[PDB]
Design a protein around this ligand. Structure first.
Ligand SMILES: Nc1ncnc2c1ncn2[C@@H]1O[C@H](COP(=O)(O)O)[C@@H](O)[C@H]1O
Ligand SMILES: Nc1ncnc2c1ncn2[C@@H]1O[C@H](COP(=O)(O)O)[C@@H](O)[C@H]1O
Ligand SMILES: Nc1ncnc2c1ncn2[C@@H]1O[C@H](COP(=O)(O)O)[C@@H](O)[C@H]1O
Lengths: 101, 99, 96
């Protein structure tokens, strides 16, 4: 297994394209996105991104960039969870996530 | 970053309003909720609530489980999380950027 | 609270039933599944979340999925630590 930061961005659904381009520009190998309801009926349409990154620094770069650009004007939260990747074509590399020395 | 518990509640879809009410009264600052499928394929909902303290997450869990989970299907779990940004969650003092 | 492993499988929509069958055959007590988008242009996929009591049960599911499918289909499998606070089946009759 390969350690990973699971970066989660939940924000207003209109920022989808802007945030995807920030993720693409970061070096992250990919991302998962989904529609969600958020309260912060009072529920509104949100989007949640989940981005597994190899380093804490890459996660922080993405978080920082989204927040500095958008979080004055739009509701959102960004957090990280620890994760381990077991299988992942691009995340772990050709030798997979359980490489030996 | 500010330590948080990510409280997850997966349950029957018909409980959405009832559980949102509990989360609202808890002092939690917000929540996410989404339609999901599940087997325990049924129509489910999943709530995600970040809480500042483990006690808040446990009180919400306790309230929901006692009120509904002997009569309806449901699972409640927590993940550790660190909040980097969150205007309401971290408040004015920010997400302790240098802690 | 009862420690748990949260196994997450993101993969192609067509494998929904096939992966569900593998999760069940593993002894896992349940799973959640949802429609997602991903890049890895955004395309439609699915995400499974499976809480397991043991790490080996999570890796058994993971191994069986990846060997059977990840040469031919897009996907990622990862695990997060979790604790279950309430669950009928996960914790048994005496609760978590
Ligand atoms: N404590 C929280 N737990 C979960 N989601 C939250 C929380 N606070 C805010 N959010 C999410 O992010 C938005 C709130 O943004 P903000 O008020 O700028 O933190 C809402 O749409 C929620 O979906
Ligand atoms: N072991 C598990 N892993 C992930 N989700 C679960 C698990 N057990 C139950 N669930 C979810 O919670 C719902 C209610 O569970 P249950 O009360 O066991 O029928 C299910 O329909 C699933 O979506
Ligand atoms: N680093 C990552 N973080 C989050 N999700 C990912 C990542 N890499 C891949 N995925 C998800 O897994 C799916 C298939 O990935 P791939 O097989 O690598 O193209 C993508 O469409 C994403 O939903």
């Amino acid at each position: 297994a390969k350690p990973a930061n699971k970066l989660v961005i939940v924000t207003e659904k209109i920022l989808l394209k802007k945030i995807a381009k920030i993720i693409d520009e970061s070096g992250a190998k990919g991302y998962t996105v989904m529609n969600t309801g958020g309260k912060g009926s009072d529920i509104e349409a949100n989007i949640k991104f989940e981005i597994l990154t190899e380093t804490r620094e890459m996660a922080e770069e993405i978080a920082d960039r989204v927040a500095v650009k958008y979080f004055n004007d739009y509701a959102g939260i960004i957090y990280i969870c620890s994760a381990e990747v077991l299988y992942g074509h691009t995340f772990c590399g050709p030798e997979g996530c359980s490489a030996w020395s």
